[PDB]
C-alpha cells in the first residue's frame, strides 16, 4: 500500500491506475508510479511506498 | 498557457493512407492522457482512441484495427489506415477528461474522403 | 454499452430552467466519472462538469449537474438565448472491457425567446 500526500486520509481510488481511470491527477515514487499512472504537472497529490 | 492545434486534415480518395498530428504546447510529455475524437458533418461526437502518460492506448471498438494512435513529446498522432467515405469529419484531440485540470480542445481538422 | 440521453429538441422559454438527461446501461467507472459538454456551431465543445457535478472554471453557475452510476442530469437554470447549443455527456468505463471513454448522441436546447 501507499502514503499519499495531497495539495490544497486521501483517497487513492481517485488516482488512475495504469491505463485507468481517476479525478485526481497523482504522481510519486519508482513504485507506485509502477501501478499508477504519473502525472508531476498540476499534480493534485504525491504518493509514496509505505514501509512497514 | 496550455493548447492543442490539429493538423493534417485534407481530401483523400478511399483506401488513401492519412496522418493527423495533434500539436502539443505549454503541457509537459508525460502529465496528460491525450484523446482523439471526431464529428461528422450534422452528427454527434465519436471519441476514437486515447494515449495515456504510461503510454497504454485503447480504441473505440469500431475504430480497433482501423486507427492507430501515437505520440512523441510535442505531439499526438493518428493514422487512419484504410479511409471511406464515412471517416469524412472535423478530427479533435483533447485532454484528459475527468482532470480538474482545464480539458483543452484544439479547433479540429477537417477530413474529407471522397472519389 | 448504450448511452441514451434526452431527444431533441429540447425547448427551453427564456429564464426557464431546462434538464438534460443521460443514461448509461452500465455504470461509469467509480459511479461520479461523467463530464458535460456545450457545443455551439463551428467550434469544439466545451466542459461544463466533470466528477457528475463539480463546475469547470469559467463557467456560469447556472450549470448543474447531478446523478451517479447509470443515471446523470444537466440542469440549466434562467435559460438565455446564449445557451442554444448541443449538450453532450461523456463516460467513463474499463477500456479493457468496454469503450474507455462514450460520448451519449446529444441533446440540441432550442431557446423561445
Known amino acids: 500500500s501507499f502514503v499519499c500526500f495531497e495539495h490544497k486520509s486521501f483517497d487513492i481510488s481517485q488516482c488512475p491506475k495504469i491505463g485507468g481511470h481517476g479525478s485526481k491527477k497523482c504522481t510519486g515514487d519508482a513504485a507506485f508510479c509502477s501501478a499508477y499512472e504519473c502525472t508531476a504537472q498540476y499534480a493534485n497529490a504525491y504518493c509514496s511506498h509505505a514501509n512497514g | 498557457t496550455g493548447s492543442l492545434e490539429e493538423s493534417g486534415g485534407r481530401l483523400v480518395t478511399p483506401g488513401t493512407p492519412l496522418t493527423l498530428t495533434c500539436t502539443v504546447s505549454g503541457i509537459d510529455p508525460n502529465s496528460d492522457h491525450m484523446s482523439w475524437v471526431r464529428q461528422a458533418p450534422g452528427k454527434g461526437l465519436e471519441w476514437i482512441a486515447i494515449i495515456y502518460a504510461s503510454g497504454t492506448t485503447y480504441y473505440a471498438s469500431w475504430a480497433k484495427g482501423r486507427f492507430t494512435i501515437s505520440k512523441t513529446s510535442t505531439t499526438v498522432d493518428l493514422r487512419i489506415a484504410s479511409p471511406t467515405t464515412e471517416d469524412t469529419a472535423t478530427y479533435f484531440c483533447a485532454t484528459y477528461p475527468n482532470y480538474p485540470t482545464d480539458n483543452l480542445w484544439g479547433q479540429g481538422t477537417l477530413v474529407t474522403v471522397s472519389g | 454499452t448504450g448511452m441514451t440521453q434526452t431527444p431533441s429538441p429540447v425547448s427551453a422559454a427564456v429564464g426557464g430552467t431546462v434538464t438534460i438527461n443521460c443514461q448509461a446501461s452500465?455504470?461509469?467507472?467509480?459511479?461520479?466519472?461523467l463530464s458535460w459538454y456545450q457545443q455551439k456551431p463551428g467550434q469544439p465543445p466545451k466542459r461544463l462538469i466533470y466528477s457528475a457535478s463539480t463546475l469547470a472554471s469559467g463557467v456560469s453557475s447556472r450549470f448543474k449537474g447531478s446523478g451517479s452510476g447509470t443515471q446523470f442530469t444537466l440542469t440549466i437554470s434562467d435559460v438565455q438565448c446564449d445557451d442554444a447549443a448541443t449538450y453532450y455527456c461523456?463516460?467513463?468505463?474499463?477500456?479493457?472491457?468496454?469503450?474507455?471513454?462514450?460520448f451519449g448522441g446529444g441533446t440540441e436546447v432550442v431557446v423561445k425567446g
Open positions: 461523456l463516460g467513463s468505463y474499463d477500456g479493457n472491457s468496454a469503450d474507455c471513454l462514450a
Open positions: 452500465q455504470s461509469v467507472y467509480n459511479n461520479y466519472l
